[PDB]
Every structure is written in structure tokens, then in C-alpha cells.
Write a protein that binds this ligand. Structure first.
Ligand code: HEM
Ligand code: HEM
Lengths: 152, 152
């Protein structure tokens, strides 16, 4: 279960999926600020998550921190270093007192945004299917490892 | 645990999403045996999950149990009874001893299958978008509540 190789096998994530995520890097990068604004504004709309963004109003760091994570989904090198880093990300949220429910909530926001980029840029059905399948795997892997930080 | 109303607000799940899911019920009904076979075969194909299907071998009651859950996604009405039932579903996996990682894996299988039904049956880009968005919300809400069952 615990190694990256094992996790990839369970999700049937292969080098083809990694190549497809790399092929989406330019679109993700083009759209990174739109993603960051929509992500940040959605959180500002829920009082419970809005709390965590009060100090950030002045510090002005957290929009960039989550923007950078989004870009990393497409950066390649999905290896044991990548999983270790996700475990760290998960624990950061546990440490500040964020309920895991809001991680699931946030991940829905990213998922809808990214699938809309795919729908809007890939008219060919099988190109679209393959890119959607790769993105759903990486988002689900991210959510899986982060969720496990609340248990472990 | 949160109320259905609060969960819907966090996921921006509206009466329109509930109506779209209800409208997918006949489509679900005509794909349910294909879903049930693919879901059960995927679990047989990982040794860790296949261990939990040993007792089920002869009559495959669990294949039906999982099929029935899939069709229930498309009931078109969702209130506190639906959240309570998801807690019961999560708890059933906790009590048999299944690591929650495999619930995330299985939800990716169902997600990919269901989004292919949407792509394969809805040529109109906006009809597709709206149905995909409703499906991703209800799957993410199921995953969210089931995950919560593993936290004291
Ligand atoms: C898709 C879900 C999420 C992902 C992938 C994510 C990603 C990250 C990353 C990469 C970091 C930097 C952690 C580190 O390396 O130290 C971080 C920190 C942080 N995130 Fe998130 N995040 C998510 C959801 C949320 C939500 C919903 C909130 C609520 C407002 C939030 C608030 C925070 C805060 C407050 C920190 C800094 C913790 C500290 O002060 O040490 N995150 N997040
Ligand atoms: C999308 C993820 C899954 C969903 C939505 C789901 C759904 C369900 C439902 C609705 C039940 C009946 C619960 C009840 O009313 O008592 C159940 C039971 C069960 N499921 Fe799943 N399931 C999922 C993943 C899995 C996985 C990955 C396995 C691994 C083999 C599994 C094995 C079982 C077993 C063994 C039971 C019976 C537990 C008992 O003895 O009561 N399920 N599931």
C-alpha cells in the first residue's frame, strides 16, 4: 500500500498518465492565477475556512502556496519524494486545525476547474478521455495521501 | 457530523444538481450490470482487496450490494437520511478492517466509469458540463463522509 509504486499500481497510473499530465503543463500554467483566484475566493465564501485566511489578508502568501501545489500536479516525477511531500502537506493542515472535510471540499473545486480546462481545449473525444482519466488519478492520489495524514 | 444542508452548501450542491442526478437514473439502470462487473473485477485484481471477497465467492451478494449503491447515487433527493446512510456505509468498511486507501481507489474506478457514461451519451458541451459537475459533487460527498468514518 504505502510505496508510490504500489499506489500507482492500485490506481493503474502509468508512464502514459505521467506523459499526459506533462502535456497539460502549459494549460495549467496559463490558468494558474485563475485557479488560485477561484480556489481562494471559494474558501473566503465559507466562514469556517475563511477563518484561516484572516492573517493571510496582510501576509499574502497562501494564494501563492496553493497555486504552486496546483502547478506541481503537472510537473512530472511522481515518485517516493512526491508521496513524502504530500504526507507533509497533509500534516500541515492537521497541525493548524483544519477539518479534513474541507480538504475534500477544496479538492472538488480543483477537480471541476481542471476538467473544465480539458473540456474547453480538447474537442477530440479520446484525447479528452485520456487527459481526464490522468487528471482524475493524480487528484485522487493527492486526496488519498492527504486523507491518510489525518489517520496516521 | 454536519447536516446534509451544510454539506450541500460547502460543495455548492443545489436543487438543480439533485434534479440532474435524478435525470441520470435510467442511464444508470442500463449500465448497472457493466458497472457491477467492472467494479468487482477490479477488487478481485488487487490481492489486498480480494482477501475481503473470500467469503463472498459463491453467491456474490457483495457484487449486488455495490451495484445497488451505484444506482442510489441517482435517487434525485438527498437529506439527512442520505448522510446517515453514508456513515453506515463507511462504518461497514471500518468494521471488516478494510484500509481506507482502498475506498479512495474504488471511488476513482466508479468516477472514471461514470464520467465515461456522461461523455459517451451527451454530445452537447453544456449538458455534459452540468452533468459532470453534479456527478463529481455526489461522488466527492460520498467519499468525504465514508472517509470520516475512519476518524474517532
Ligand atoms: C486540495 C486541497 C488542498 C491542498 C492540495 C493544499 C495544499 C497546501 C500546501 C502544499 C501547503 C504548504 C504546506 C507545507 O508544505 O508546509 C498548504 C498549507 C496550508 N493550507 Fe492548504 N491545501 C488544501 C486545502 C486547504 C484548505 C481548504 C484550506 C483552508 C483555508 C487550506 C489552508 C492552508 C493553511 C492555513 C496552510 C498553512 C499551514 C501553516 O500555517 O503552517 N488548505 N496547503
Ligand atoms: C466507492 C467505494 C465503496 C462504496 C461506495 C461501497 C459501498 C458499500 C455498501 C453500500 C455496502 C453495504 C453497507 C451496509 O449497508 O451495511 C458495502 C459493504 C461492503 N463492502 Fe463496500 N463499498 C466501497 C468500497 C469497497 C471496497 C474497496 C471493498 C474491498 C473489497 C469493499 C468491500 C465491502 C465489504 C467486504 C462489505 C461488507 C462488510 C460487512 O461484512 O458488513 N467495498 N460497501
Amino acid at each position: 500500500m504505502l510505496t508510490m509504486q504500489e499506489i500507482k499500481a492500485h490506481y493503474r497510473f502509468t508512464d502514459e498518465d505521467a506523459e499526459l499530465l506533462g502535456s497539460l503543463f502549459p494549460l495549467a500554467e496559463t490558468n494558474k492565477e485563475r485557479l488560485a483566484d477561484q480556489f481562494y475566493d471559494y474558501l473566503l465564501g465559507i466562514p469556517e475556512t475563511a477563518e484561516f485566511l484572516k492573517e493571510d489578508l496582510v501576509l499574502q502568501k497562501l494564494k501563492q502556496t496553493h497555486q504552486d501545489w496546483f502547478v506541481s500536479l503537472f510537473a512530472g516525477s511522481y515518485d517516493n519524494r512526491y508521496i513524502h511531500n504530500l504526507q507533509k502537506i497533509g500534516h500541515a493542515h492537521v497541525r493548524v486545525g483544519l477539518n479534513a472535510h474541507y480538504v475534500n471540499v477544496a479538492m472538488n473545486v480543483v477537480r471541476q476547474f481542471t476538467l473544465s480546462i480539458i473540456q474547453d481545449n480538447f474537442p477530440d473525444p479520446e484525447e479528452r478521455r485520456q487527459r481526464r482519466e490522468a487528471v482524475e488519478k493524480i487528484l485522487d492520489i493527492n486526496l488519498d495521501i492527504m486523507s491518510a495524514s489525518y489517520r496516521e
